[PDB]
Amino acid sequence: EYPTVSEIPVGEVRLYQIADGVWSHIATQSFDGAVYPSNGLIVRDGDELLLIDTAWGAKNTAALLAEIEKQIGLPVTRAVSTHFHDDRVGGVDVLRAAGVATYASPSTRRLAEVEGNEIPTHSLEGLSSSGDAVRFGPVELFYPGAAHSTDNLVVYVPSASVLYGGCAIYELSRTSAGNVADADLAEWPTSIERIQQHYPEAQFVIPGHGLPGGLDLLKHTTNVVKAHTNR
Numbered sequence: 506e507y508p509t510v511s512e513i514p515v516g517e518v519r520l521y522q523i524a525d526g527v528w529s530h531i532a533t534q535s536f537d538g539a540v541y542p543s544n545g546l547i548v549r550d551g552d553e554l555l556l557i558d559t560a561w562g563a564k565n566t567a568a569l570l571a572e573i574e575k576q577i578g579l580p581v582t583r584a585v586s587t588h589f590h591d592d593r594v595g596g597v598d599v600l601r602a603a604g605v606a607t608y609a610s611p612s613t614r615r616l617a618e619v620e621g622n623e624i625p626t627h628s629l630e631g632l633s634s635s636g637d638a639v640r641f642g643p644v645e646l647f648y649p650g651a652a653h654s655t656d657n658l659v660v661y662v663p664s665a666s667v668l669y670g671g672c673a674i675y676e677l678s679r680t681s682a683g684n685v686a687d688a689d690l691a692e693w694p695t696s697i698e699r700i701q702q703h704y705p706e707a708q709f710v711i712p713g714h715g716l717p718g719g720l721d722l723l724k725h726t727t728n729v730v731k732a733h734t735n736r
């Protein structure tokens with residue numbers, strides 16, 4: 506069973522096996538007087554591990570590495586953050602101090618700087634405009650356009666048809682858009698469409714928060730955004 510927010514005390518991290526050599530990681534953190542769960546991804550990269558996003562904080566991120574070493578035992582050597590926001594780049598300085606080379610799009614780096622967040626070391630080239638894809642070890646990065654934020658990437662794992670949607674994709678449970686300050690509610694339904702066309706083989710879809718689903722999570726989001734654009 507997939508771990509839910511009430512089962513993860515803040516400062517602990519869980520690892521969930523999605524497919525051979527593909528895990529998600531789950532943590533919890535306070536935002537505005539509530540606690541929420543957050544997902545990220547882990548992909549075997551030959552003898553190494555590629556990390557997708559932090560565990561939303563330095564202490565959570567430290568616990569992430571410790572779980573990885575207990576449960577998997579291969580080093581995390583690279584990390585990709587999928588947008589700027591404490592829940593994707595919070596912990597980058599911990600990762601760096603452990604020896605992890607951290608990566609983000611230059612739009613993502615720019616925005617983390619403006620906002621006071623931690624900034625990954627290395628700039629990902631090749632993701633400037635919507636539709637762009639770039640291969641990154643065992644995964645393909647893909648920028649579909651604005652959505653949850655303007656810089657936000659998704660990640661597909663081709664060996665296993667796993668699609669990591671980051672905060673641009675909601676879980677069915679979720680029926681409200683929540684906090685969309687930095688969002689493009691106009692382009693958002695677009696960028697989902699660009700996702701659906703690019704990854705129709707997706708067997709597993711993971712949102713930035715809550716329960717993994719299938720490609721229905723795409724449409725489920727779209728709607729939820731609209732209801733917030735209409736009403």
Ligand SMILES: CCCCCCc1sc(N)nc1C(=O)O
Pocket residue numbers: 536541542591592672676679683684713714715
């Ligand atoms: C499954 C619960 C969903 C509510 C989450 C609200 C938060 S907190 C945070 N750091 N990000 C978000 C987001 O929407 O991306």
Ligand SMILES: [Zn+2]
Pocket residue numbers: 588589590592653654672
């Ligand atoms: Zn965000």
Ligand SMILES: [Zn+2]
Pocket residue numbers: 590592672713714
């Ligand atoms: Zn988020």
